[PDB]
Structure formats: C-alpha cells, structure tokens
Design an enzyme around this catalytic site. Structure first.
Site, mmCIF file in Angstrom:
data_model
loop_
_atom_site.group_PDB
_atom_site.id
_atom_site.type_symbol
_atom_site.label_atom_id
_atom_site.label_comp_id
_atom_site.label_asym_id
_atom_site.label_seq_id
_atom_site.Cartn_x
_atom_site.Cartn_y
_atom_site.Cartn_z
ATOM 1 N N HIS A 53 0.785 -1.193 -0.312
ATOM 2 C CA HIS A 53 -0.138 -0.236 0.123
ATOM 3 C C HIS A 53 1.096 1.153 0.127
ATOM 4 O O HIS A 53 0.721 2.201 0.971
ATOM 5 C CB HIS A 53 -0.940 0.102 0.705
ATOM 6 N N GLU A 107 -4.426 0.050 -5.418
ATOM 7 C CA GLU A 107 -4.823 0.254 -6.772
ATOM 8 C C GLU A 107 -2.959 0.992 -7.577
ATOM 9 O O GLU A 107 -2.768 2.061 -7.344
ATOM 10 C CB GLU A 107 -4.170 2.098 -5.292
ATOM 11 N N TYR A 158 -15.529 5.493 -5.454
ATOM 12 C CA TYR A 158 -15.046 6.082 -4.549
ATOM 13 C C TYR A 158 -16.796 7.497 -5.038
ATOM 14 O O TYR A 158 -17.185 8.441 -4.893
ATOM 15 C CB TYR A 158 -14.157 7.413 -3.961
ATOM 16 N N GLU A 177 -12.533 -0.866 -0.702
ATOM 17 C CA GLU A 177 -12.370 0.228 -0.476
ATOM 18 C C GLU A 177 -14.243 1.031 -0.724
ATOM 19 O O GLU A 177 -14.062 0.853 -1.691
ATOM 20 C CB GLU A 177 -10.920 1.258 -0.711
HETATM 21 O O1 LIG Z 1 -7.457 6.651 -3.930
HETATM 22 C C1 LIG Z 1 -8.770 5.690 -2.954
HETATM 23 C C2 LIG Z 1 -7.420 6.318 -2.037
HETATM 24 O O2 LIG Z 1 -8.137 7.070 -1.555
HETATM 25 C C3 LIG Z 1 -7.965 7.255 -0.079
HETATM 26 O O3 LIG Z 1 -8.637 8.257 0.330
HETATM 27 C C4 LIG Z 1 -7.567 6.199 0.519
HETATM 28 O O4 LIG Z 1 -6.721 7.091 2.230
HETATM 29 C C5 LIG Z 1 -6.147 5.111 0.483
HETATM 30 O O5 LIG Z 1 -6.089 4.172 1.191
HETATM 31 C C6 LIG Z 1 -6.579 4.465 -0.992
HETATM 32 O O6 LIG Z 1 -5.759 4.131 -1.400
#
Ligand SMILES: OC[C@H]1O[C@@H](O)[C@H](O)[C@@H](O)[C@@H]1O
Ligand SMILES: OC[C@H]1O[C@@H](O)[C@H](O)[C@@H](O)[C@@H]1O
Ligand SMILES: OC[C@H]1O[C@@H](O)[C@H](O)[C@@H](O)[C@@H]1O
Ligand SMILES: OC[C@H]1O[C@@H](O)[C@H](O)[C@@H](O)[C@@H]1O
Lengths: 448, 448, 448, 448
Positions: free
Chosen positions: D120, D165, D292, D351
């Site tokens: 990571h 990622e 996200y 995530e």
């Molecule tokens: O691009 C995704 C990334 O988002 C960030 O907000 C997180 O802190 C990272 O750990 C994650 O890999």
C-alpha cells in the site's frame, strides 16, 4: 542616398516621472505614480521615480548632452502635479519655474522644445475625484493646458496633448499593470472615452488661447496575419481594433471600431453625439510612437481581445521582448498617412530599443551594437516611408536617457545616453554617437 | 603590465555532448535522462530540447575547421555514455563509439589536444531505471564505462576528466529538481553526492590499472563573500560555502565531509562506511576548475536547505544568466584552491565564460558581443594575476566553443564564442572569438 | 442555570441587498460597483455573480412567510442605493423605492420589525466614477440618499443603520482589492476610511433634521489574542488590533485615530482637519456589532501593511471560511465594546453565524446542520454571559436568513439558517434556523 | 424495499500502514519512500507527516476493541514492507514482523478475518535507491517479500491482496509526482505500471508455490461519463478511461494494453516482450474494487497527458476531497467490472467511503456526520442493486476505520467512520460508524 527632406527635425524624447525625480520637492504635488510606485508588489525590484535621473537638478548638464548629440529638438512632458499640485486651483510657481528655465535653456541652445501635457502622471487629488472616469476631467485638463499654452506662448510652438491613450487605459484601467492600477473593462471603456474628450477639449482651448500646432500622440502596433485560418484573422481584427483603431477612428470622426462591442461586451457603452463632435476637433499634427509589430492568433481564454501574439523566433528581440522588424515601421507610417488622408503632418515622437547595458561606463564608453543596429535600420525605414509619400516631419529617439521604465523599473535601458543610477554620471552610448552623426549629416552617414 | 603566459600554457574551448551533438536516437544511440527530461512538458524553457542542438554529430568536421581558425591548442569535450553504451552496461554501440574515434583522430591531426570528459550530466536512462546515482553500484558501472574509453583512446586522449561538476549534477538533479533526472529530495541529494564521489574514485582506480596519461575531476566553485558583519550572516555564508564549494572538495582531499552539512541536511544527513572515503580520495593527477562568478550570501531562514540567499550586487554588471561579473574573485578562488591542494596539484580552468544576448542570426556576417569580449579579457588577466601569486595553472578552456542548449534554460542563453544560427546551423565567429584567437596567438601579449 | 433573555430583547435575522436580491437591472435600477466587479473575470470564485442570487426581489413575499415560520421579531436588511437613486444623485427611481416601500409594509404587517441599513457595500457606479469613497463630497451624496429613505419610511422604519462594516469596505475594497471596487492602495485606504466616517456623521446629522427614530453605525470586530509572550508578537497584535478594531471605533468615540496607524500606514498616513472629527463623533442612539471569530496575530515582516498574520488555532473547529470557533471571545468583545462605549450606548449583535458545507439540494426536505446548530447554541449562550456582566445588549441578528452570494467567495459559502437551492430557488429550513426559531419562542429557555 | 445481503457476505473496514501506524523508526523498522517524501518541504499539506498518525503501532489493541464495537467481521490492512524487511531485501526485522504476528492473532481471537495487503504505497527507500518500480528486478524483490508473509501467516491469513491501486501508485508517484516517490515523467510512468503488473504476477506465482488461501489485486476504478455529444469530448473520455480504468485491468485479463495508450503517452509508450504479459495475467482467486466517485471528462488540449478534464457536476453534493456523490455509478461500475472479468472472478468492494469536515475533537462524546452517514447508506444500497444484477460480490470494506493521514492532503481529510483526535489520540465513533455497526448486524436490514 538617405538624405532627409529640408527641415526634417531630429530630436530625443523623455517623460517627467521617468527622469525628473524630486517628487515632493518645492511644493510639487502627489501623483498617481507616487502612490502606485510606493505600493509593494507594483514595481520591479521596488524601484520608484523618487530620484530617477535627478533631471530636476541636473537639467543644465542634460541640455549640454543634447548639444553634444546635435539635437535640434527635445521632446518632454510636463508634470501636471508639479505645476498644479491639486490638479485644479493653485499654481506651484517654483514647479512651473523649472519648466520655465528648461524651455529658455533649450531656446538659448537652439533646440526646439516639444512639450507634452500628459505623460501618464495624473494628480492624485484628481484620481480621488474619479480620475479619467470623471467626465469633468475634460475641463480640468483643458484648464491645465491653458496655463501652459499661455505661459509658454511663442516659446513652445508644437504641442502634444495625450501621450498614448491606449497604454494609459489598457495598462491603467483594463489590466492594472500601470497607475492607477485598476482592472475593469467597464472602467476601461469609460476612461478611454474621457481621455479622448480631454484631448478634444484641450484642442478647443488651444484655438482660443494658444499659438502654434497641437496634436495627439498615438502608439500603433501593426497586427500581421498568423495563418490563413479565419479564426486567426478575426483575432487579428480584434487585437487591431482594441489597440490601433480604438482611439484613431473616433479621432478621425468615424466613431468607435465595430469590434469593441464584441471585445468589451456588456462593458461597452454608447455615448452622446456631442462627445464625438468634441473628440474629433481638428488637429495640426499627430505623433507616432512606434517600436514593433505583433502577429496575433486566436486565444479564447485571453481577456478581453481573445488574442495572443505569436513569437517570431526568426528575428531579434529586445529586452522588453519586442520583435525587431523595421519594415513594419514603414508599413505603419504608410497606413497612418492613408488614415489621415495624407493631409496631417506626422512626426515619429518615439522610437528606440532596450538592451542590456552595464550599470557603469567601461573605459568611459558604453558599447550597444544592437541598439546601434535598431537605430540605423529604423531610421532607414523612415526614409522608405517618406519616399512612399508620407508627410513625415521629424524623428524623436526614445530615449535621451536611461530612465525609469515605469513598472519594469530601471532594469530596461532605452537611453542613447547611459545613466549610472548610483552616481548619476552620464555617458553617451555608441548609439548616441551614431545618432549625433545622423543629425550632422542629415541621414548621409547611413550610406556607410 | 605584461600578460605573457607561462611556457606550455594550454589554450582551448569547451563543450558538452547533449548541449551540441543532436542526433539523439541516431545510429543505435541509447536514451539518456535528458532525452526523457527535455521531452516532458514544463521542464525546458520554450520547450527546447537537445534533439538537434548544434548538429555537431553531423557537422564536427566544420567545427574542427573553426577550432583551427580560433588557433585552439586544445578541445575539451564530453563523451555521451548512452551513445557509446546504449543501456549504460553491456553491449557497445560501435558506430556511436566510431564518432568519437573519428573526432579524436580529426583533432590530433589538426594538432589539437583532445581533452575528454567521461560524464557531463547525460546518464543513460537504463541506469536511471536502476536507481541512477542513488544506486551504489554506479561506481562500478562508471568505472567499466571509463575503461572502455581509457583503452580505446589510449595514447590519443592523455588528459581525462571524470565528473563535470558534481554539485550541479546533485543540487540540480536531485535536491531541487530543475535538472535531469528531476528529483527533489535532501535524502537523495546526500546519497547521490556520495555515489558521484565514489564513482569518480572508482574510475581513477580503474585508470591506474588500464589507463595512460593524467586523470582528475572537474569542480565548479562559487566563492562566498560576507554580506555584513552580522554573525548570523557569517553562519549563513559558511552553510552556503559548505554545501556548494566544500561538499565535494573536502572528501576528495581526504578530509571527510564539511561539518556544516549535518546542520544543512538535518535528518537527511548520513554517515557512510570508512572504505567509501578511502575510495573517494584516490589521488588524482590534476583538477579542473569551472568558474563564472561569486555570491554574497546572507541569512535566509526560509531558504531550503542552506537557509541562505545571495545579495544582489547592483554595483556590478550581470550576465544573462544573472551572474555577477567580478574577475578578482577568480584570482581569489584559484589561490584558495591552490592552498586547499597544497600547491602540488596542477590546476586548469576547464570552463569560464559569459552569457549575453546575441541576435538569432549574424548581422553582415558578424556578431558584436562587447560584454562577452570585456568578460573574456578581464578574466584571462585575472588568471595571470593568480599565476603571479604561485598558482600552478596550466590551461584555460573557454566556455563555450558554440552557442548551445543551456540545459533547462534552452537556447535562450548563448555562451558561445562562435555564434550558432539554430535555424540554419550557420556558424559565425563572435568578436569575443576573434579576440580569443589573438590571445592564443600572442600567448597573452595582446592584453599588453 | 437559566439562559432566558431580558424583556424586550429583539430576535432577528440579517441580509444584504446584493447578496440576495438579484434583478440588478430590473425596473430602472442603476449600476453598482458590484455589478462591475462581479462581471470582471477572476474576481469571483467560480465566476459567480449577484445577477440572480436568491431572487429575493421577486420572492420577498415567500421569504417573509419564512421569517414567520422562524418566529423572527426583527428583519435586518439593506437598501440598494443604485436601485433607489440610479445615478447616486438626482432623479429617484420610483419602482426601486416601491419595492422597499412594499417590503417594509409587508414586514410591519407580519408584525416583524424592519431594521434598514443604508450602505451594505453596493456603491452606485456613477458615484465610483466620481471617486467613490475617495471623494469628500460623498458625505453629502450619502446624506441626501439617507434623507430620501428617512422621509419615505418616516414612522415605519424606526431603527436605522448607516454604514455596515467600514473596515471591510475599506480593507477589502481599497487596501487589498479583494472586494469592489477592487483598489489596492494604502494611500486610498486612509482617505476612504476617513470619508466613510464622515459620511456616517453627515447621515446622522441629516437624520436629526428630517428623521424619526434611532440611528447608528455597524462595526465588525475581530478580537486579537496573544500568540506568545514575545515583544514582537505583542506589537504585531496592537498593529492588527488598531488597524481593524480601533481604526473606526476610536474617532467615533471622539478619541481620535489610533496612534499605531502612523506606524501601519507609514508615508500613506495623513492628518485631517479637526472639524471632520466633530462630524464623525456625532452622537448615535445605538451601535451594531458584527462578530464571527477571533484571531491570534503573530509578527509577519513581509505581510503588508500591518506586518502581522494569524496563527492557526488547531485545537478548535474552523468554519468553511476558515474562521476559528471560539464563543468566549464573543463574550469578551461585548464586554470590551461596552467599556469602549461607556455602557451609555445600546448595543445589538447585528451579525453572527457560521458557514459549513451543505449539499446543493435538500435531502428529504431537511438540511442537517450539526456544526452550525452547535455554533448558534454556544454563541447565543455567550451573549447571556455578556448580559450577565452588564453589557447593554438589546438584540441578536443571525447571519444569515438565506444562503446567499458570499461576495468574492460566491455561492460556495453558506451562512443561512435557511437553505437555498440555487438551482430551483427552493427554500428549506436548516436544523440551525430550527433551533433558532425555538430559541426565540422560549426566549433563551430552550438553551438550559 | 429489501436490503438484506447474501449469506456469507463479509462486512469490514480498511486501513493502510503508513496512514495509521506511526512509529516509523521503531524497533528496527526501515525507511520508506514516504518517510523521505513527507519530510521534504512543500510535499505535504500543513507539513503533516506519518510520524505519529493514529499511533496504531502502539494502540492496535484498543483499535481491535473498536472493530468489535462496530461488529466488524473483517479488517483489511496493509503490511509495511520496510518495517518487516528494513532494506527491502535480505535480513528480516523480527520485532517488526512480530507486530503483524500479534495483530493477526488478536484479530482471529476476536473473530475478525484478517485481510492483508502486501503493498500500500510504502516502498522501502533502499529499493527506491535501486530504481524502485522502474527496476524490472522489483518483481522478484516483491515475490521474496510476499513469501516471507505467506509462510509466516500460513493458515492464519487466508485472503491476500498484492498491489493496492496500481493507477494511483503510478499516476501519482511517477507521472505527476504528487505522491511518493515524487517523479514526473511519462517515460517512467509507462515502465512503472508495467513492473507493478509484473510484480503482481510474480507474487501470485510465489503464492501458488508457498502460500495458502486466495490472492488477487486491488484496482481503483473511476467510471467516466459523457460531458456532451461532441466527438472531441468522447475521445477525451476514452483517453481518460483507458489511462485510469483499463490500463491495468485489460492486461490482467489477457487483453494486452489498451490501444489508446499509444495516443496518451506518445513517444513515451513502449512495447514489452510477450513473456511479460503471461506473467501479468497469472490467474487470481479474487479481485478488489476501490470505488468513491465518477468523473465527466471533456476535451482539454493542454491537460497532460490524457488531454481531458472533469466537468464539475454542480447538481450533486461533493465531498471535502472534491469528489461527486453519485451512488448509481457504483452499481454501474460493479456491473462493468463483472462483465470485464467474465463473471467468473469473485469481487469485493475493498474500499468505499467519503470525507467530510469534522471538528478536531468530539462534541460531547459524539461526532455527528450526517453527510457521511448519507453516503454510506446510499452506496451500500447501490451494492445491493449490483448483487441483484448478478455480480458475485462477496464483501464490503469501509474506508476507513479511522481518520488518518490522507497522504499529501495530510490530516485535513477525514475518511474514518471512527473519529480520531490527533491531539489526544482519543477515538470517537462517528454517527456513520454507529449506522455501519447496525447495517452489519441486520445484514443490511436497516436500509429497509
Ligand atoms: O484512491 C483510493 C485511496 O483513497 C484514499 O482516500 C485512501 O486514503 C487510500 O488508502 C486509498 O487507496
Ligand atoms: O519604453 C517604452 C516606452 O513606451 C512609450 O511609448 C512611452 O511613451 C514611454 O514612456 C515608454 O518608456
Ligand atoms: O552554466 C553554463 C555552463 O556551466 C557549466 O559548468 C556546465 O558544465 C555547462 O554545461 C553549462 O553550460
Ligand atoms: O463574511 C460573512 C458576512 O460578513 C459580514 O460581516 C458581512 O456584512 C456579510 O455581507 C458577509 O456575508
């Protein structure tokens, strides 16, 4: 052969704030540049005109230099706030006395004084009443003009009203790089109109109380095509309208260029007919300030003309980043002759170039071969224009002295005479040496 | 005043591969960090690259002819690592090696001393991908690369340079990131600086094993003068001096790293194995000095990482790269460097010169560069002063032979004594070059 | 502990004309400086303007219904000078005045007390072109404007505010140029501040002649707390405190200008006629206070002109405008202001509130507002603490009734206790305005 | 409306080593690229570092209790490479490995499934000194690193992730330089991406040899929607989509690199040997999706290198990191990813979360985060929509367990469902966390 016509006047030019210093001396008032230059961030290296060339004190030395250069004329501006500290009302006698001595000194030396009423140094007191945004400034400016018209009647015979309305407005009101440092298209449109009205009012006053010839001074930067793309030609017209035709067109009684409705958009305004009648008050001559050309292309994000100049890497560029291309001077002179019907006497009131020079003389000399080259090629271009029928009556080299190049400070040297700003020592550059010879030979020296 | 130079004093001019060669991909040449860096938007002024440059790879015969017109006795050049070994390690590129094979033979036969530099900032990209100067193995890769040249040109190239300016390589390339490979890290700068030194030492060891002639490193020194009598300024001066002038010199002289670097680099500073310092201090036969100017540092708490900034010396001229012109500091530096080496290490000014604006084309077959002329004659005199004080100075290489790619500043900074029209590749000897040819012919006598 | 408020304590919400009204050109309304400023590229975040805003000019009836739902007892608003008198002087616009006529009738009819502000930053462009706040005549222009309203709303508007936050008008509009008219000058800032004070006084005098009710000014105060024990920092704190909090209060109390301003504004500082200060200190019936946060100034030599900068207080929450949340400072400021007035002047918190992120649309008819809800509870309590130490506080106006144009920061900063969906103009009462409506009903009891 | 999830569906929360652990040098831990990057001025917002962070290295037992309070069924975390193997290769750090040993034991005994991520973003500095991801050997270094963990946690950690990622690692670390190691080069970006894929493959192969359980990669996907119907914009959308979403997925699926990449990267693009693509497409057992938001790219000629830019979707809410809130895009992406993998690969949202402003301390023992609550519920619902459409989704990990160091954005961006007071290290479960704990407990039934 490069011999010039009978009576062709050779000189050099300056501006009050750029050379005089003594900003507060002997009751002199406060100008917009006194304020602007003392605001942090406005001037390169924090330079101000507080001392400059110290010309207010050393003018007698400077007149001697003119004679060494064989100058037949000296073009200068009068500081409005030095003569009338509050812009209106009470005179400053000692301030006015400086120009009184200066002009008499020039006349005794056989040098024709060519005075400019306004070279960008508006009295702060009038800025506080709106400056060039206040339509009353036309009256304030005519009154100021009258004072000099009558005080120097029979001594100053050739007058300029406004020096470069475009720079005054584009720099001072549109983009804010120059005093009074406003940034607004709404204010730019209004300021431009009132500058024109002020010029017109000054000419009317001159007919009433003045003796000699009066005219405005325009800078023109000819715009050349960047491509065959229609988008670029449209861009070229926008740049050209905003810079070269904005003031010339209404001065010729043709109204404002049509493109300004597009360029300034919602900021554009229509003005009463009597204003245009005033603005077009007939003049006796016109000054051309000329340095370079541009090659505009379409630039959608560039405000407000939506245009940008294409770098002409095939030619030399001065330290201000201006292309060196003397044929465009000839073109511009021909163009301006046509715009005026060939019936308006023309005078190159400014032309010159900035290059690096050391801060001190070396072996009592300053060798500036590029300034030398710029000078001779552009004077040749004048000769070409005259041969094409342009009624061109003179040439003023910018500048007599290295000086404060406004917001760029002392870093840009335009002088044909070097000034050591640490000691105030003057040194005639190689460019000045050649120019003195051009005058003596009336152009003949350009043969070789 | 006599400026006759010692018997055997060597006069030449200097270049570097990436700055003049062009033909970056030609004939099996490998990719370097500058091939990558120059083609990344925002890195280079005006987007300039070394893709064409002076086209020297193709035009070297013409350039040798120019050297003869300049009466040069030596030619200092660099070998492109990635042109000779495309991947930095492994297979040779025969036709790339053949270029330098022809060049050297061409020089020798013109009666010109070939002075070769192993590394002038153009690291192979393939080695950068393996960590570049951050990988301790680069000491061995570099020694191997050196061996190829040491043996190929044995008896032909007798005076060798290893690294050109470790400070610029590291400060620019790793600390601040304005140069290839474009890293910004105090942690990497400390490490890269150490491996540059080790790589130099390894190459000298390899030279003793397989080489013939003299070998040394080339340092740039910018002497630091006091800005005031304030203690915090003197502390600032020492920091700046340590980071720029003593960082590499001291361990090269076997005295370890300057004490101030612990304070300058803080947590990024490290201690290294004792065997490293033994390698770094491997005795050399001569040392090159690259010199242009001085600085006057004062305390600047927010300046990273030395907490110092130069005070602009407005009393003196400055070049187009913004460097103060002050030749006594050159004399002072040579004496200082002579002292630091015990007077027993032969010195040679491997680079000295100045950048001033020149037009992009010759004017009437000439280029008049009076400030470059003035800089040249005053600094050469300053060499004579140093020699008079007992400095073992044995040569002078003018930077540069040709106008070239001034790295990140692109073609906008002309250092050449010979003008290059980058549109046509036409060469024109500048007035500075004309004078230098006479300085060589008269061995200094022309200076009096 | 009871947080009940004294009988007669007035509860309301506050707005400003340009921030909410829209309809900039509607029904003969004039052009203001914010019409110009907002339509100049680069001045406003996201290019936001007040062309539409909350469309309040069209939706004022709906909004009054909302005031009722919030149980408001007063509504504080500003009148648009250029909507009423398009050219700033002379001819009145009947329809523009009719809107405010109707608005006030609607307020009184709904049982809600109308608190009018004369000037909330939207100067007529016609007056700006005559110098704006730099022209001493503006005192007369303002008084005449005030009279038009004083007479028109005789007996209907009984509580009057003259100038809303002279400091923001001058510091933002003339000193730093972040707000209309976007000037950047210490010289102009000094003069503007003085004329703002003069215009306040002339307005009060006119009020005595022609008006019925009470009149006063509204100041913003940002209490400056110590950042350290260092002398430099305490000096910085005084400079910051003087320039922001004492600049206008002191002469309003007849104490003259603070001594530190001579140090802050240097050569730009000026002395004024004694007769001016008598006009400035014209007795008022009340004073309004705008309060949001505090600052913790430290020394900052390159920060112009107060040479100070706030230290981020990381221990506390911050609003989206970056202002520290610290309710005790409101209590202290109210005590301090009581001391400065001498307890003899009725006080009224005329703006207080906070900005936090809210979605652009309501989520299920709700806007959940925990931090703004929290800000309101803690700060209303802090008033009680002030009332507890005997500050004559008579009311509280929440900024703001509606999410609106936060000037240069555009619509991105929401201060409303009522959410405005700028896409649909749909209103939604936030949890913040909903605790508020309850606070009034219980007259402070709900806080226990 | 029914929102019950399939049997075995796994609920958890996620962290990363450098973002929470602190104790960067503790117990023989090595130096990483983020240790260097974060301590370089200008790299991190507010100069924030991960030196302390959440102090999780010391407080992991407290945090495990929090996971139980949140009734987490899984905890996804990363192992710090340089904490376990200080120099990247060679000697293992016992106490460093011991930390993760005890951590996994605590999780298993709490009934929480440990989901370990190998990489990571915290590459050992010692390996970066060898070229890092530009060195093809890193595939072997990474495989060796993986083996250490595979054997140490054999039978205890059963679900493994290789690379977190690759796009962010390469786009941020090598293309634009906004993240460690802070390089800006398209040439390096192309190579880094390839070696990341190769390293993933090599680790999977090693896992087959010495590991137990299931292994796969974690990709971030940001779905790209049309900005208009203009062809220029669709081409921009394809360029953006290929470089971000397909660059790594396509070769992972044996489809080679997207053809658009020759257009995006131009001369920086390379062809690689066929053997590499066999290694890259080494069959995996599962794949993670980090999701996200979406983007709406339009043509942007000056945007390098994809020549695209996102159009701000003002109709929707945006988080404090500037990301649009649009749950339907999550459902669409899962469907897309399912189709791309042939429906035969098991998926896990590994995530998902949102950042909003929270105060630096709890307000009385609570943190009310209604927008984060809203984000959580609407997106978990969008998961159900996806599962209803046939996507083999096996779990959901909330980003993040704790407020932490958001890399270059520092601590200013809070993603936690548990609030962390970085002044006191005190944890407080946000309202979002309270909702999440119930969503798990009712297995989604609360969304009903
Ligand atoms: O691009 C995704 C990334 O988002 C960030 O907000 C997180 O802190 C990272 O750990 C994650 O890999
Ligand atoms: O140097 C540039 C020059 O532009 C001219 O057109 C102005 O009249 C001068 O005052 C100025 O110095
Ligand atoms: O900066 C001028 C010169 O400095 C020298 O020391 C470098 O070796 C050259 O490549 C550079 O052109
Ligand atoms: O900055 C928030 C508020 O500050 C107040 O003091 C001003 O009067 C308002 O117009 C502004 O919206």
């Amino acid at each position: 052969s490069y011999r010039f016509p009978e009576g062709f006047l050779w000189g050099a030019a300056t501006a009050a704030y750029q050379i005089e210093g003594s900003s507060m001396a002997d009751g002199a008032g406060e100008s917009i540049w006194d304020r602007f230059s003392h605001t942090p961030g406005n001037m390169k290296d924090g330079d101000t005109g507080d001392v400059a060339c110290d010309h207010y004190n050393r003018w007698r030395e400077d007149i001697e230099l003119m004679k060494r250069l064989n100058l037949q004329a000296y073009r200068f501006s009068v500081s409005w706030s030095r003569v009338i500290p509050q812009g209106r009302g009470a005179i400053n006698p000692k301030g006015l006395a400086f120009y009184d001595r200066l002009v008499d000194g020039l006349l005794e030396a056989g040098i024709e004084p060519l005075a400019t009423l306004y070279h960008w140094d508006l009295p702060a007191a009038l800025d506080d009443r709106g400056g060039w945004l206040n339509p009353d400034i036309a009256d304030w400016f005519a009154d100021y003009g009258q004072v000099l018209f009558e005080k120097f009647k029979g001594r100053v015979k050739t007058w300029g009203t406004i020096n470069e309305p475009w720079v005054i407005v584009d720099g001072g009101y549109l983009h804010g790089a120059l005093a009074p440092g406003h940034r607004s298209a709404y204010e730019a449109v209004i300021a431009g109109h009132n500058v024109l009205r002020a010029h017109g009012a000054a000419v009317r006053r001159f007919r009433e109380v003045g003796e000699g010839q009066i005219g405005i001074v325009l800078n023109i930067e000819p715009k050349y095509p960047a491509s065959d793309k229609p988008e670029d030609e449209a861009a070229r017209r926008r740049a050209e309208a905003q810079m070269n035709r904005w003031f010339l067109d209404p001065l010729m009684g043709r109204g404002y260029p049509e493109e300004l409705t597009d360029v300034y958009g919602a900021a554009w305004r229509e003005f009463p007919k009597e204003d245009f009648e005033l603005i077009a008050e007939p003049t006796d001559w016109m000054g051309l300030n000329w340095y370079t050309r541009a090659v505009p292309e379409n630039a959608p994000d560039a405000w407000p003309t939506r245009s940008r100049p294409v770098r002409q890497t095939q030619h030399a560029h001065t330290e201000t980043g201006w292309e060196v291309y003397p044929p465009a001077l000839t073109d511009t002179l021909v163009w301006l002759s046509e715009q005026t019907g060939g019936k308006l006497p023309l005078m190159v009131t400014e032309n010159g170039s900035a290059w690096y020079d050391p801060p001190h003389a070396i072996d009592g000399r300053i060798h500036d071969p590029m300034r030398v080259h710029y000078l001779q090629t552009h004077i040749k271009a004048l000769h070409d224009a005259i041969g094409k029928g342009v009624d061109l009556r003179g040439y003023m080299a910018w500048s007599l002295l290295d000086n404060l190049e406004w917001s760029l400070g002392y870093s840009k040297r335009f002088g044909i005479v070097h000034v050591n700003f640490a000691t105030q020592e003057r040194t005639i550059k190689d460019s000045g040496l050649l120019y003195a010879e051009v005058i003596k030979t009336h152009g003949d020296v350009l043969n070789t």
